[PDB]
Design a protein around this nucleic acid. Structure first.
Length: 270
DNA sequence: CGTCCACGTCTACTAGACCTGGACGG
Protein backbone atom coordinates (compact mmCIF):
# COMPACT_ATOMS: atom_id res chain seq x y z
CA UNK A 1 0.00 0.00 0.00
CA UNK A 2 0.94 3.54 -0.91
CA UNK A 3 -1.06 6.56 0.05
CA UNK A 4 -3.76 6.06 -2.46
CA UNK A 5 -4.33 2.43 -1.36
CA UNK A 6 -4.48 3.51 2.24
CA UNK A 7 -7.10 6.04 1.29
CA UNK A 8 -9.12 3.56 -0.82
CA UNK A 9 -8.97 1.04 1.97
CA UNK A 10 -10.34 3.59 4.50
CA UNK A 11 -13.09 4.44 2.18
CA UNK A 12 -13.85 0.85 1.63
CA UNK A 13 -14.19 0.22 5.37
CA UNK A 14 -16.50 3.15 5.61
CA UNK A 15 -18.68 2.11 2.71
CA UNK A 16 -18.71 -1.61 3.50
CA UNK A 17 -19.45 -1.03 7.13
CA UNK A 18 -22.03 1.65 6.69
CA UNK A 19 -24.90 -0.63 7.63
CA UNK A 20 -23.08 -3.17 9.73
CA UNK A 21 -23.04 -3.56 13.40
CA UNK A 22 -20.21 -5.49 15.01
CA UNK A 23 -20.13 -7.25 18.29
CA UNK A 24 -17.78 -9.27 20.40
CA UNK A 25 -14.04 -9.10 20.62
CA UNK A 26 -11.29 -8.07 18.33
CA UNK A 27 -9.46 -11.22 17.36
CA UNK A 28 -5.85 -11.29 16.42
CA UNK A 29 -4.58 -14.31 14.54
CA UNK A 30 -1.93 -16.56 16.08
CA UNK A 31 1.77 -15.68 15.83
CA UNK A 32 0.55 -12.08 15.68
CA UNK A 33 3.51 -10.00 16.86
CA UNK A 34 1.21 -7.01 16.86
CA UNK A 35 -0.58 -6.34 20.08
CA UNK A 36 -3.89 -7.75 21.13
CA UNK A 37 -6.65 -5.26 20.93
CA UNK A 38 -8.34 -5.00 24.30
CA UNK A 39 -11.83 -4.13 23.19
CA UNK A 40 -15.21 -5.86 23.69
CA UNK A 41 -18.70 -4.48 22.88
CA UNK A 42 -22.06 -6.09 22.13
CA UNK A 43 -22.80 -3.67 19.39
CA UNK A 44 -20.22 -1.29 17.67
CA UNK A 45 -19.76 0.53 14.36
CA UNK A 46 -16.50 0.89 12.53
CA UNK A 47 -15.12 3.82 10.58
CA UNK A 48 -11.92 5.00 9.16
CA UNK A 49 -9.81 7.69 7.84
CA UNK A 50 -6.45 7.78 6.18
CA UNK A 51 -3.42 9.95 6.47
CA UNK A 52 -0.46 9.35 4.29
CA UNK A 53 0.59 5.78 4.47
CA UNK A 54 -1.48 5.25 7.67
CA UNK A 55 -5.05 4.32 8.34
CA UNK A 56 -7.00 4.91 11.50
CA UNK A 57 -9.94 2.70 12.51
CA UNK A 58 -12.51 3.91 14.93
CA UNK A 59 -14.54 1.38 16.97
CA UNK A 60 -17.65 3.04 18.27
CA UNK A 61 -20.02 1.31 20.73
CA UNK A 62 -23.66 1.96 20.04
CA UNK A 63 -25.74 3.54 22.83
CA UNK A 64 -26.26 1.03 25.57
CA UNK A 65 -23.70 -1.48 24.36
CA UNK A 66 -22.14 -3.70 27.03
CA UNK A 67 -19.29 -3.76 28.52
CA UNK A 68 -19.03 -0.05 28.77
CA UNK A 69 -16.53 1.03 26.17
CA UNK A 70 -15.22 4.33 25.16
CA UNK A 71 -14.75 4.49 21.37
CA UNK A 72 -11.37 2.99 20.55
CA UNK A 73 -8.95 4.05 17.80
CA UNK A 74 -6.35 1.89 16.03
CA UNK A 75 -3.75 3.01 13.62
CA UNK A 76 -2.45 0.70 10.98
CA UNK A 77 0.52 0.70 8.62
CA UNK A 78 0.29 -1.73 5.70
CA UNK A 79 3.91 -2.67 4.96
CA UNK A 80 4.30 -4.35 1.57
CA UNK A 81 0.95 -6.17 1.56
CA UNK A 82 -1.54 -4.88 4.10
CA UNK A 83 -5.16 -4.65 3.02
CA UNK A 84 -8.65 -4.97 4.36
CA UNK A 85 -11.37 -7.33 3.43
CA UNK A 86 -14.89 -7.86 4.39
CA UNK A 87 -15.51 -11.69 4.21
CA UNK A 88 -18.06 -14.38 5.27
CA UNK A 89 -17.21 -15.19 8.89
CA UNK A 90 -16.02 -18.79 8.07
CA UNK A 91 -14.40 -18.10 4.68
CA UNK A 92 -11.53 -16.20 6.26
CA UNK A 93 -8.88 -15.33 3.70
CA UNK A 94 -5.49 -16.00 5.30
CA UNK A 95 -3.43 -14.55 6.64
CA UNK A 96 -6.13 -12.41 8.21
CA UNK A 97 -4.23 -11.23 11.23
CA UNK A 98 -6.88 -9.08 12.84
CA UNK A 99 -10.58 -9.70 12.76
CA UNK A 100 -13.76 -7.80 13.60
CA UNK A 101 -17.01 -9.80 13.52
CA UNK A 102 -20.46 -8.67 12.64
CA UNK A 103 -23.26 -9.14 15.10
CA UNK A 104 -26.23 -11.53 14.46
CA UNK A 105 -28.99 -9.59 12.84
CA UNK A 106 -27.85 -10.78 9.33
CA UNK A 107 -25.22 -12.84 7.50
CA UNK A 108 -22.10 -13.16 9.67
CA UNK A 109 -19.03 -11.32 8.25
CA UNK A 110 -15.50 -10.67 9.30
CA UNK A 111 -13.68 -7.39 8.45
CA UNK A 112 -10.09 -8.49 8.30
CA UNK A 113 -6.81 -6.84 8.17
CA UNK A 114 -5.07 -9.17 5.72
CA UNK A 115 -1.31 -9.08 5.46
CA UNK A 116 0.63 -11.83 3.69
CA UNK A 117 4.18 -10.68 4.45
CA UNK A 118 3.35 -9.37 7.96
CA UNK A 119 5.28 -6.15 7.49
CA UNK A 120 2.24 -4.18 8.63
CA UNK A 121 1.87 -2.92 12.17
CA UNK A 122 -0.82 -1.54 14.41
CA UNK A 123 -0.56 0.30 17.65
CA UNK A 124 -2.94 1.03 20.40
CA UNK A 125 -3.79 4.68 20.67
CA UNK A 126 -5.32 6.33 17.72
CA UNK A 127 -2.20 8.42 17.17
CA UNK A 128 -0.53 9.17 13.83
CA UNK A 129 3.08 8.25 13.89
CA UNK A 130 5.06 11.01 15.40
CA UNK A 131 7.33 12.32 12.78
CA UNK A 132 5.25 11.48 9.71
CA UNK A 133 4.71 14.67 7.76
CA UNK A 134 1.24 15.58 6.63
CA UNK A 135 -0.78 13.66 4.09
CA UNK A 136 -0.03 14.56 0.45
CA UNK A 137 -3.64 13.89 -0.47
CA UNK A 138 -5.57 15.31 2.37
CA UNK A 139 -3.34 18.00 3.84
CA UNK A 140 -1.67 19.41 0.76
CA UNK A 141 -1.00 22.94 1.87
CA UNK A 142 0.41 21.72 5.14
CA UNK A 143 2.43 19.17 3.26
CA UNK A 144 3.77 21.76 0.89
CA UNK A 145 4.75 24.13 3.74
CA UNK A 146 6.43 21.49 5.74
CA UNK A 147 8.67 20.83 2.78
CA UNK A 148 9.52 24.42 1.86
CA UNK A 149 10.09 25.65 5.48
CA UNK A 150 12.66 22.76 5.87
CA UNK A 151 14.99 22.52 2.95
CA UNK A 152 17.97 23.00 5.22
CA UNK A 153 17.22 19.51 6.52
CA UNK A 154 19.91 17.10 5.53
CA UNK A 155 17.17 14.85 4.10
CA UNK A 156 17.35 17.17 1.22
CA UNK A 157 20.98 16.53 0.43
CA UNK A 158 19.88 13.21 -1.01
CA UNK A 159 18.67 12.43 -4.52
CA UNK A 160 15.18 13.59 -5.16
CA UNK A 161 14.11 9.99 -5.81
CA UNK A 162 15.18 9.07 -2.22
CA UNK A 163 13.89 12.18 -0.46
CA UNK A 164 10.49 11.43 -2.00
CA UNK A 165 10.31 8.26 0.09
CA UNK A 166 11.14 10.07 3.29
CA UNK A 167 7.84 9.93 5.17
CA UNK A 168 8.77 12.86 7.35
CA UNK A 169 8.00 15.16 4.34
CA UNK A 170 6.31 12.93 1.77
CA UNK A 171 3.86 10.87 3.88
CA UNK A 172 2.08 8.68 1.42
CA UNK A 173 4.59 8.60 -1.42
CA UNK A 174 5.98 5.18 -2.30
CA UNK A 175 7.96 3.51 -4.97
CA UNK A 176 5.55 3.58 -7.80
CA UNK A 177 4.46 7.14 -7.10
CA UNK A 178 7.99 8.50 -7.04
CA UNK A 179 8.66 7.14 -10.50
CA UNK A 180 5.37 8.45 -11.83
CA UNK A 181 5.87 11.84 -10.22
CA UNK A 182 9.40 12.32 -11.58
CA UNK A 183 8.37 11.09 -14.96
CA UNK A 184 5.58 13.52 -15.41
CA UNK A 185 8.24 16.35 -15.14
CA UNK A 186 11.28 14.57 -16.56
CA UNK A 187 13.19 15.37 -13.44
CA UNK A 188 16.11 13.06 -13.32
CA UNK A 189 15.71 10.80 -10.34
CA UNK A 190 19.20 11.56 -9.12
CA UNK A 191 19.09 15.25 -9.28
CA UNK A 192 19.65 16.68 -5.82
CA UNK A 193 16.46 17.23 -3.89
CA UNK A 194 17.28 20.59 -2.56
CA UNK A 195 18.11 21.88 -6.03
CA UNK A 196 14.75 20.75 -7.41
CA UNK A 197 12.84 22.12 -4.43
CA UNK A 198 14.67 25.43 -3.84
CA UNK A 199 13.34 26.45 -7.25
CA UNK A 200 9.92 26.79 -5.61
CA UNK A 201 11.24 28.33 -2.40
CA UNK A 202 2.23 22.10 -11.98
CA UNK A 203 5.43 21.77 -9.99
CA UNK A 204 6.79 18.75 -8.14
CA UNK A 205 5.07 19.45 -4.85
CA UNK A 206 1.74 19.83 -6.69
CA UNK A 207 2.20 16.50 -8.49
CA UNK A 208 2.89 14.83 -5.13
CA UNK A 209 -0.70 15.57 -4.40
CA UNK A 210 -2.51 15.26 -7.74
CA UNK A 211 -0.70 12.18 -9.04
CA UNK A 212 -1.65 10.06 -6.05
CA UNK A 213 -4.99 11.68 -6.33
CA UNK A 214 -5.48 10.35 -9.87
CA UNK A 215 -5.12 6.80 -8.49
CA UNK A 216 -7.78 7.41 -5.91
CA UNK A 217 -10.15 8.46 -8.65
CA UNK A 218 -9.56 5.36 -10.59
CA UNK A 219 -11.31 3.83 -7.58
CA UNK A 220 -10.75 0.13 -7.01
CA UNK A 221 -7.76 -1.24 -5.11
CA UNK A 222 -4.89 0.59 -6.84
CA UNK A 223 -1.57 -1.25 -6.65
CA UNK A 224 -3.28 -3.96 -4.54
CA UNK A 225 -5.51 -5.04 -7.50
CA UNK A 226 -5.45 -8.68 -8.70
CA UNK A 227 -4.65 -9.88 -12.21
CA UNK A 228 -7.68 -10.23 -14.37
CA UNK A 229 -9.54 -8.17 -11.87
CA UNK A 230 -11.08 -5.16 -13.52
CA UNK A 231 -9.34 -2.51 -11.45
CA UNK A 232 -5.98 -4.10 -12.14
CA UNK A 233 -6.20 -3.30 -15.85
CA UNK A 234 -7.13 0.22 -14.86
CA UNK A 235 -4.12 0.56 -12.61
CA UNK A 236 -1.61 -0.99 -15.05
CA UNK A 237 -3.03 1.20 -17.76
CA UNK A 238 -2.55 4.35 -15.64
CA UNK A 239 1.09 3.65 -15.01
CA UNK A 240 3.36 5.40 -17.47
CA UNK A 241 6.74 4.66 -16.04
CA UNK A 242 7.01 2.33 -13.08
CA UNK A 243 8.14 -1.00 -14.55
CA UNK A 244 7.21 0.01 -18.07
CA UNK A 245 9.01 -1.29 -21.18
CA UNK A 246 11.46 1.35 -22.60
CA UNK A 247 12.27 2.77 -19.13
CA UNK A 248 15.50 2.60 -17.25
CA UNK A 249 15.75 1.62 -13.69
CA UNK A 250 18.48 1.82 -11.15
CA UNK A 251 19.02 0.91 -7.52
CA UNK A 252 18.95 3.74 -5.04
CA UNK A 253 21.09 3.75 -1.97
CA UNK A 254 18.66 1.60 0.02
CA UNK A 255 18.28 -1.02 -2.67
CA UNK A 256 14.90 0.23 -3.91
CA UNK A 257 14.42 0.48 -7.62
CA UNK A 258 13.72 3.79 -9.23
CA UNK A 259 12.19 3.62 -12.63
CA UNK A 260 12.68 6.54 -15.05
CA UNK A 261 13.33 7.73 -18.59
CA UNK A 262 16.42 9.44 -19.97
CA UNK A 263 18.96 11.23 -17.85
CA UNK A 264 19.63 9.48 -14.52
CA UNK A 265 20.89 12.73 -13.03
CA UNK A 266 24.12 13.89 -11.35
CA UNK A 267 24.00 11.91 -8.14
CA UNK A 268 23.51 8.51 -9.77
CA UNK A 269 25.25 5.46 -8.42
CA UNK A 270 28.24 4.85 -10.74
C1' DC B 1 14.18 -28.14 -7.15
C1' DG B 2 16.25 -23.48 -7.14
C1' DT B 3 17.14 -17.49 -7.58
C1' DC B 4 14.98 -13.01 -7.70
C1' DC B 5 11.60 -9.80 -7.00
C1' DA B 6 7.77 -7.09 -4.83
C1' DC B 7 3.18 -1.09 -3.20
C1' DG B 8 8.10 -0.38 3.72
C1' DT B 9 9.44 0.46 7.55
C1' DC B 10 12.34 -0.96 11.81
C1' DT B 11 16.37 -1.43 14.34
C1' DA B 12 20.57 -2.94 15.76
C1' DC B 13 25.41 -1.21 14.06
C1' DT B 14 24.36 1.60 6.10
C1' DA B 15 23.54 -2.95 5.86
C1' DG B 16 20.43 -6.49 7.45
C1' DA B 17 16.09 -8.10 9.27
C1' DC B 18 11.34 -8.96 8.96
C1' DC B 19 7.90 -12.28 5.49
C1' DT B 20 5.12 -15.04 1.79
C1' DG B 21 4.47 -16.24 -2.87
C1' DG B 22 4.75 -15.50 -7.87
C1' DA B 23 7.63 -15.56 -12.17
C1' DC B 24 10.51 -17.81 -14.17
C1' DG B 25 15.34 -20.62 -14.82
C1' DG B 26 17.36 -25.28 -14.97
Amino acid sequence: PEGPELHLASQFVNEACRALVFGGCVEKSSVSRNPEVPFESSAYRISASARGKELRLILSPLPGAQPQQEPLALVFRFGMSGSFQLVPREELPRHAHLRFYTAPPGPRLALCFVDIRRFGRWDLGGKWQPGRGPCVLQEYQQFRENVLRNLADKAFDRPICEALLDQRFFNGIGNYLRAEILYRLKIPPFEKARSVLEALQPDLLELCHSVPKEVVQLGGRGYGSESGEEDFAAFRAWLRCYGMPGMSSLQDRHGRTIWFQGDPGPLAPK
